[PDB]
Design a protein around this ligand. Structure first.
Ligand SMILES: Nc1ccn([C@H]2C[C@H](O)[C@@H](COP(=O)(O)OP(=O)(O)OP(=O)(O)O)O2)c(=O)n1
Ligand SMILES: [Ca+2]
Ligand SMILES: [Ca+2]
Ligand SMILES: [Ca+2]
Length: 341
DNA sequence: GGCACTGATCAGG
DNA sequence: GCCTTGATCAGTGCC
């Protein structure tokens, strides 16, 4: 099997440069402002000119400005990026009907039936890069290997504006030498659990007793890692379907007052139904982010679709449930809908 | 024993 | 900050 993975470079910031080419060569930081005070919010992404100096996704805007006070700080325009992304995704469908759109800026193509070997695959990857550059003036990185996991590791290694193949021999090398923390799906908490077991490379998971592994990180991740170490991971490229759609808004001030919270909750419902478009959910969850930033949620599933009127009345009941069962003040409040008809 | 369902967790974009 | 193109866990009700 041959998998080609495409990952768009510094995507949000790059779209902003395409739309305003005077930004080219300047550090650009795309921000999500929460509106609680001035410059409250977090960085969504930054282009490489900013990232070079430590301005990275997730950090506080105030922290970014301490590092690069003269960078260009732009508000996130996700609707614009989403529309640009959709156009590029339509470009990719021309190269394979087996395509898995994995997020707003990534896709997997199964090109098993389009090329014979890694040489032809590399050439097709070049063709894809040039096409997206030609039509949308966006640069991407391409990773190619025998499965989705190594195709992604390949792209990680070639970023930015690159292309890389991980052939069968290199796959065997990585199983021995790749830092296990760098395997997709292994986050800090799991990486720490593993280190405490002495596992530092995929190969190590083959010699440890399975129940030990499973007891620490769970059955699913244990099997996942072992399948990879044995060079036996194969998951097909699958069409992804949206399963939940929601909106969460930050309140001006932390509160436990129902009447205070309601106007924000109802705004989240309005925006959520807008995003639902033609989908009709049978389930609704109210989702509260506490002051200490924990997340608490309560839901309700109906044997029928939920009208916006039913969303309003049920959401208040669920929020009350949350207030009844947790005593912390709420900082953000929202809803998420799912189980579409 | 194991399926179906919930809310919490961990992950990653 | 915000979103799920999320999956999996423990706890449970149930057959
Ligand atoms: N914590 C994060 C990470 C990413 N994103 C958004 C903005 C990114 O542009 C996009 C893609 O994520 P990458 O993780 O693919 O980021 P870039 O595409 O920004 O960087 P790179 O060139 O390393 O791929 O998703 C976000 O909102 N919040
Ligand atoms: Ca990217
Ligand atoms: Ca990405
Ligand atoms: Ca990691």
């Amino acid at each position: 099997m041959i998998v080609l993975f495409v990952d768009f470079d510094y995507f949000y910031a790059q779209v902003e440069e395409v739309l305003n080419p005077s930004l080219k060569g300047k550090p650009v930081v795309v921000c999500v402002f929460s509106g609680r005070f001035e410059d409250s919010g977090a960085v969504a992404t930054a282009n490489y000119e900013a990232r070079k100096f430590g301005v990275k996704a997730g950090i506080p805007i105030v922290e970014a400005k301490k590092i690069l006070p003269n960078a260009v700080y732009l508000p996130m325009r996700k609707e614009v990026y989403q529309q640009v992304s959709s156009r590029i995704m339509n470009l990719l469908r021309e190269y394979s009907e087996k395509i898995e759109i994995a997020s707003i800026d990534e896709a997997y193509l199964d090109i098993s039936d389009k090329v014979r070997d890694y040489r032809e695959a590399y050439n097709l990857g070049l063709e894809i890069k040039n096409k997206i550059l030609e039509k949308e003036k966006i640069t991407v990185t391409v990773g190619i290997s025998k499965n989705k996991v190594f195709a992604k590791i390949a792209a990680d290694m070639a970023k930015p504006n690159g292309i890389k193949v991980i052939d069968d021999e290199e796959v065997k090398r990585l199983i021995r030498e790749l830092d296990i923390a760098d395997v997709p799906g292994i986050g800090n908490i799991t990486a720490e659990k593993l280190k405490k077991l002495g596992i530092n490379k995929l190969v190590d998971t083959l010699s440890i007793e399975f129940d030990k592994l499973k007891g620490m990180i769970g059955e699913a991740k244990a099997k996942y890692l072992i399948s990879l170490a044995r060079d036996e991971y194969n998951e097909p490229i699958r069409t992804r379907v949206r399963k939940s759609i929601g909106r969460i808004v930050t309140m001006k001030r932390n509160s436990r007052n129902l009447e205070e919270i309601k106007p924000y909750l109802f705004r989240a419902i309005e925006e959520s139904y807008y995003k639902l478009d033609k989908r009709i959910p049978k389930a609704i969850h109210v989702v509260a982010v506490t002051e200490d930033l924990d997340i608490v949620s309560r839901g309700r599933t109906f044997p029928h679709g939920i009208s916006k009127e039913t969303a309003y009345s049920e959401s208040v009941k669920l929020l009350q449930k949350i207030l009844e069962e947790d005593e912390r003040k709420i900082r953000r409040i929202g809803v998420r809908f799912s189980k579409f008809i």
